[PDB]
Structure 1
């Protein structure tokens, strides 16, 4: 399949497949020619959702405006952008930070009265 379908096929996978895939990306030709996909598949967000940890907004609760403030301060988005990212709860509040940052972001959000998860 086109390389622009395999790279994705991977992303689709989960800890199970990625491991089954990497465990299906080795011996055939040793860990040598396997390190390529191994070191590439390793950086799978999960173990870093540093160790890409993001923040998901399960719900804002009754304190919507409160949750908005936290978002407008973390992401820096406008009033309309923030509320739009909290109402429908598009999850992805911000990704790329570290475990400490995300753990902190989640904390700040929870304080506002919002339920957050860490994939």
Structure 2
């Protein structure tokens, strides 16, 4: 009685592992596998980390929305509109995880114009 049904209850008789091995077996035997795999995804790490991830937030454009808008699109490159809305939607994050030098560069720019910036 080597029916197909009996084979069904057979797989439901063994452990998942046994099922993995089986499937894996046939896969090779009948050669019905896309032996290749693809996904790409990972993220290594190790002591001795750097500190060049500063976030520049914009609190108040101040009485110089003009210069600000410039600094914005200038630091990013978003459409005039997008930039406008951004500022108009204050507070708004200008940059995230950028080099300190860059952060302070724009920061000083905001100050020169007379705007309120946030560094975190």
TM-score, normalised by the number of residues in structure 2: 0.54
Superposed CA offset, 1:15-67 (max 9, x none)? 99999999999999999999999999999999999443111111011211221
Task: Find the structure with the greater CA-based Rg.
Answer: 2
> Which has the larger share of strand?
2
* Residue-pair matches, total: 119
Q: Please state how far the C-alpha of 1:90 moved relative to its aligned partner.
A: 3.6
> Which has the larger share of helix?
1
Which structure 1 residue ranges, 4+ long, deviate > 4 Å from structure 2? Answer: 1-49
Q: Alpha carbons of 1:69 and 1:41: their partners in 2 closer, same or farther (altered >3 Å)?
A: same
Q: Alpha carbons of 1:7 and 1:43: their partners in 2 closer, same or farther (altered >3 Å)?
A: farther
TM-score, normalised by the number of residues in structure 1: 0.54
CA RMSD between the two structures: 15.0
- Segments of 5+ residues of structure 2 without an aligned counterpart are none
- Segments of 5+ residues of structure 1 without an aligned counterpart are none
